[PDB]
Amino acid sequence: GSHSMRYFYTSVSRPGRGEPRFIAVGYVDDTQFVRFDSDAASQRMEPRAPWIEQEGPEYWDQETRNVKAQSQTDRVDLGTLRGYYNQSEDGSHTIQIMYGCDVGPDGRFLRGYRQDAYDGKDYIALNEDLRSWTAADMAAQITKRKWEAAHAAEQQRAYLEGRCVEWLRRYLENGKETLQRTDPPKTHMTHHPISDHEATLRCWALGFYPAEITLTWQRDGEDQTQDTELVETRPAGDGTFQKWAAVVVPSGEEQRYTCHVQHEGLPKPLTLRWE
């Protein structure tokens, strides 16, 4: 199938309490492999997955230096944006950046990304063409202009279409036994009477990968999506994910309910019934 590499940067200012906290994490699909944290003792880009550990010292010194150059850029960017929105010097603000590339089953480049946010909302984003930008407001318009005069997009595109996919393919090869796999979900149902007239039916999905999944409750074949409660997919901590969907059914009608699970792993959509 297709694969992706994605990095996430978060810079949180903290006036008076020192320089802003910078955190970066790298991912290949749904598996993290590196991380940098300014509030950590190492002050180095560190490994978060066994397979990235085969990279020599020069790799780590490079990532550290280049990711530190990034904290430097974000540190001052935090200041100018504060200006753009005429915000006080004592407030805490955050800049988030996400960027990466997707490749298909043959390792070919499909698309690249680069999107930035300020205080939890979109600020500016590189368009699919990797040649133009989309500013969310008048402030980002100031940045859009500066970024055009500097031909910033060209630099981004060169990376997204070059080293981004080159290294994405490399990681997929170096950690093939762990990255190129799909763990189908293990499923079971639970039952909780809410009263003598109602009961909760919860459908579970455990130890699956990738994280993307679909859980649905049907009654007599009829889709019940609206009375169904779903929790956010969550990580088990071992590289697999979990998730459940629940539904409140009249005491005595549970036999009519069916849970359907859809995942890239399982050859065919599963179907669970109470009893």
Partner: peptide, 10 residues
């Protein structure tokens, strides 16, 4: 691998 250099200042 992250970019060799950060993006132009905002």
């Amino acid at each position: 691998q992250v970019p060799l250099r950060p993006m132009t200042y905002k």
